[PDB]
């Protein structure tokens, strides 16, 4: 950690006012509340008062202004929408890079309302795949379901949906959430899907999880698997979310130093990079 | 089908994963870099190509007694044709 | 200590190693990378900044653009490469 | 074919090093499938010779050894079919 660091180098020495001193003393309480948010922001702890965060998909169980401020700071500047946008563009890029390998005519950028990113009651479509040949589709299965049973039907247009969630301690199971929301949105009346067949990928940012339960076609399983792996490993927006969370938590994880100038490392001292020994 | 099983597959495996390879041309120059694109006629387009070769002072003292030095140059993006290219090898 | 031998590619590779310069059924190579119009790979912070600038619909200011251009020019100059003046002055 | 990417590289200032050591840097205006580089307002420096500036040049693709493009070349969008 970094005890007494803050955003202003903790501003310990100063001629600060008593109210400012109280605020500085309350900042570590903000860090503690942010740290323990997943286990105290759950509906088991507080009954009722389930209010979604502004322009964000996070629900605030119990009026905790400290946690409200901390989460607003973390998700400043429409970070949820940017994260969802980055994920959808990355998935589209991955699918385009492997277009002809799975008999996909093309991919489609569905017109998405901004709120869709943080719309939990209903949903919409994110990516549309168009085919030159018929796609035989299989019955719904989880992302980890190695064995899938094939459904006796085919399609031409295939939908992919991305749902981001902030799971608390009791509801951090991504697979159950993905399955329930797939079985809800597909059979919903305020959610319109281009085709009955498709895949819904749920991503838990609070715990860094991901799972898909929709209808799958052959060849899409490994592609989606490595796509999710690479998008959890190197997404820019997700990295920014992680960095903001780390800054809010003041988790200054220790890091190692560079290798010393030994008898097998001096050969890089005569390279094009200017190096100096002091 | 046959594009990933021929002799140019080492030129394709280093261009698919953007790996670093060194190509020695007919002018005794070794260009090391990541091949961005290839073709059937070995027209390799690479990025950040470091061309290392051997240079000589060419009788700087007047008696032709000098040692060759390892000269190196850097290019942002290069497009070397497959005519002058002699050999190529990926980095181990 | 290995010079660049004529008609040989192993010597340059050894010098670079010493200098430290180095279902349907398929295995889809899902590779995702961040690049710019200049072709250079972008740091995750830079990629996020570009994405946010494109999403917000407004780019950086003139001063920030000039600073970024100067930094890029300085980086290009540094990556392209006073001893003689110190030897002559001594 | 990589000749189609070089054919779409018109109105670009690039350099081309030949097999005889002559490097000609200029704005390429035309390129066929045989890498016939017709450029305008170029400057060619031969091997152990002084550089000479010409208003127009037509270098053949057979004697062209290598090329050199700047960092503002969109190779990710020009190498597509």
């Amino acid at each position: 950690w970094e005890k007494a660091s803050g955003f202003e180098e903790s501003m310990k020495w100063k001629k600060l006012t008593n109210a400012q001193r109280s605020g500085l003393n309350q900042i570590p309480n903000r860090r503690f509340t942010l740290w323990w948010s997943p286990t105290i922001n759950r509906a088991n702890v507080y009954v009722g008062f389930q209010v979604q965060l502004d322009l964000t998909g996070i629900f605030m169980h119990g009026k905790i202004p400290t946690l409200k401020i901390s989460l607003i700071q973390i998700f400043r500047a429409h970070l949820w929408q940017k994260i969802h946008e980055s994920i959808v563009m990355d998935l589209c890029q991955v699918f385009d890079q492997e277009l002809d390998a799975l008999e996909i005519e093309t991919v489609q950028k569905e017109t998405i309302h901004p709120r869709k990113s943080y719309k939990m009651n209903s949903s919409c479509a994110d990516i549309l795949l168009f085919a030159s040949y018929k796609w035989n589709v299989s019955r719904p299965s989880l992302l980890a379901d190695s064995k899938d049973v094939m459904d006796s039907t085919t399609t031409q247009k295939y939908w992919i949906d991305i749902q981001l969630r902030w799971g608390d301690y009791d509801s951090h199971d991504i697979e159950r959430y993905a399955r329930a929301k797939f079985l809800d949105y597909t059979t919903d009346n305020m959610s319109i899907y281009p085709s009955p067949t498709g895949v819904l990928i749920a991503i838990d940012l609070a715990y860094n999880l991901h799972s898909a339960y929709g209808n799958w076609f052959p060849g899409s399983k490994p592609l989606i698997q490595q796509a999710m792996a690479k998008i959890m490993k190197a997404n820019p927006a997700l990295y920014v979310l992680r960095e903001r969370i780390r800054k809010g938590l003041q988790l200054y994880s220790s890091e190692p130093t560079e290798p010393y100038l030994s008898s097998q490392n001096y050969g890089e001292l005569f390279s094009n990079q200017i190096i100096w020994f002091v | 089908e046959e594009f990933n099983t021929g002799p140019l597959s080492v030129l394709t495996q280093s261009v698919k994963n953007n790996t670093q390879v060194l190509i020695n041309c007919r002018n005794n120059k070794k260009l090391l870099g990541r091949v961005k694109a290839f073709d059937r006629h070995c027209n390799m387009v690479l990025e950040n190509v470091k061309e290392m070769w051997t240079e000589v002072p060419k009788s700087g003292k007047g008696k032709k007694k000098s040692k060759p030095v390892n000269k190196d140059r850097y290019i942002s993006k290069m497009f070397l044709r497959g005519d002058s290219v002699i050999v190529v090898l990926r980095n181990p | 200590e290995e010079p660049i031998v004529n008609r040989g590619l192993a010597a340059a590779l050894l010098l670079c190693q010493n200098k430290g310069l180095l279902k349907d059924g398929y295995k889809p190579d899902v590779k995702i990378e961040y690049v710019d119009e200049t072709g250079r790979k972008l740091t995750p912070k830079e990629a996020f900044r570009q994405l946010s600038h494109r999403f917000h619909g407004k780019g950086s200011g003139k001063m920030k653009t000039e600073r970024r251009m100067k930094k890029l020019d300085e980086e290009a100059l540094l990556k392209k490469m006073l001893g003689t003046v110190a030897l002559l002055q001594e | 074919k990589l000749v189609r990417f070089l054919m779409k590289l018109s109105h670009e200032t690039v350099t081309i090093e030949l097999k005889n050591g002559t490097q000609v840097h200029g704005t390429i205006t035309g390129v066929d499938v045989s890498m016939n580089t017709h450029l305008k307002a170029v400057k060619m420096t031969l091997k152990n010779r002084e550089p000479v500036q010409l208003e127009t040049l037509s270098i053949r693709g057979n004697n062209i050894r290598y090329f050199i493009l700047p960092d503002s070349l969109p190779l990710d969008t020009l190498l597509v079919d």
């Binding site: 309302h113 | 261009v15 961005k36 059937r40 | 619909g57 | 190779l75 190498l79």
Partner: peptide, 26 residues
């Protein structure tokens, strides 16, 4: 026997100050 390594443009569509329909442009 060729291979090309090209990145994904991933055109990033506008969110703020659009003045048109709410849904994103294609």
């Amino acid at each position: 026997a060729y291979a090309i390594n090209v990145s994904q443009k991933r055109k990033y569509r506008q969110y703020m100050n659009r003045k048109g329909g709410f849904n994103r442009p294609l």
